[PDB]
């Protein structure tokens, strides 16, 4: 009875929030689309264009960590993620749909009761997990590489 | 359930001297910080260099980049400040410069892959056998960290 991918992410992240659910989905989609790691020394590098909870799902499931210099953050307030296996020619790019981010913002108000705020947290997670893939993000496989600094 | 070392190595993806540094800093911080004072108190960590070591801190001290709880101020220094939010204290750990110097002597640009991996194992064990006094200096100081 191993921990599930979800349980591993939440254990590491330390709470359940809509933004970690977004990262769980991006991580799993990247796992699916990137294909088979081509060599033992090939590393998954990721460039994220915003720093948020989501990064932690990427660290746990894609194994691209801050400590390895494999997770690269360029803060531009964009929910866009570029994934690359080293030695390959390709970037797997995922951009979360703007409508998704818009809706999640509505669930955070400064003047909520703690009960109300927590209800909206759980609603946001339902929302993220029930989106169809095409509604959730846009995927482009493009020529490109990432490298460590 | 995995051991703390298993958890760190599995997350980090290899066993290197720098992860061993981080592991020891993380367990010393877990010891010296004391009991988390409230369910809403968070461990924030400010690190003065980005290296493998940070992964141990993320896993064991729970201070992750996704949570904005791990804060990197890149100054090429193996110094770490730990803070439970709501408290008055910073727990500061500085890895001994002699330790870093010795680890640097184990890296050479044109090693064989075999020689290099031998030196990796030597360096890991070197970190793990250090006495605490030899490994780092600890200061508990008045101060706070907050998320940016
Ligand atoms: Zn979160
Ligand atoms: Zn390492």
Residue numbers in the entry:
A (entry chain A): 3 to 151
B (entry chain B): 4 to 151
The authors write:
Here, the first crystal structures from PF02663 are described, representing two bacterial and one archaeal species: B8FYU2_DESHY from the anaerobic dehalogenating bacterium Desulfito­bacterium hafniense DCB-2, Q2LQ23_SYNAS from the syntrophic bacterium Syntrophus aciditrophicus SB and Q9HJ63_THEAC from the thermoacidophilic archaeon Thermoplasma acidophilum. Two of these proteins, Q9HJ63_THEAC and Q2LQ23_SYNAS, contain two domains: an N-terminal thioredoxin-like α+β core domain (NTD) consisting of a five-stranded, mixed β-sheet flanked by several α-helices and a C-terminal zinc-finger domain (CTD). The proximity of fmdE to genes encoding the catalytic subunits suggests a role in methanogenesis for proteins in PF02663. Individual proteins within this family display differences in domain architectures, metal-ion binding propensities and dimer interactions.
B8FYU2_DESHY, on the other hand, is composed solely of the NTD. The final model includes two protein molecules (residues 3–151 for chain A; residues 4–151 for chain B), 18 ethylene glycol molecules, one Zn atom, one Ni atom and 427 water molecules in the asymmetric unit. The total β-­sheet and α-helical contents are 24% and 58%, respectively. The monomer consists of a central five-stranded, mixed β-sheet (21345 topology) with one solvent-exposed face, while the other is covered by three α-­helices. A distinctive feature of the structure is the protrusion of two helices (α4 and α5) and a connecting loop (residues 99–138) from the core of each molecule. X-ray anomalous scattering measurements indicated that the site had a mixed occupancy of zinc and nickel. The total occupancy of the zinc and nickel cations was reduced to 0.75 to match the observed scattering at this site, with a zinc:nickel ion stoichiometric ratio of 2.6:1 estimated from the ratio of their anomalous difference map peak heights. Pairwise structural comparisons of B8FYU2_DESHY, Q9HJ63_THEAC and Q2LQ23_SYNAS revealed that the NTDs of B8FYU2_DESHY and Q9HJ63_THEAC are the most similar. The second motif contains Asp58, Gln61 and Thr67 (B8FYU2_DESHY num­bering) and is located along the twofold-symmetry axis at the dimer interface. The absence of a zinc-finger domain in some PF02663 homologs, such as B8FYU2_DESHY, provides some evidence for involvement in alternate processes.
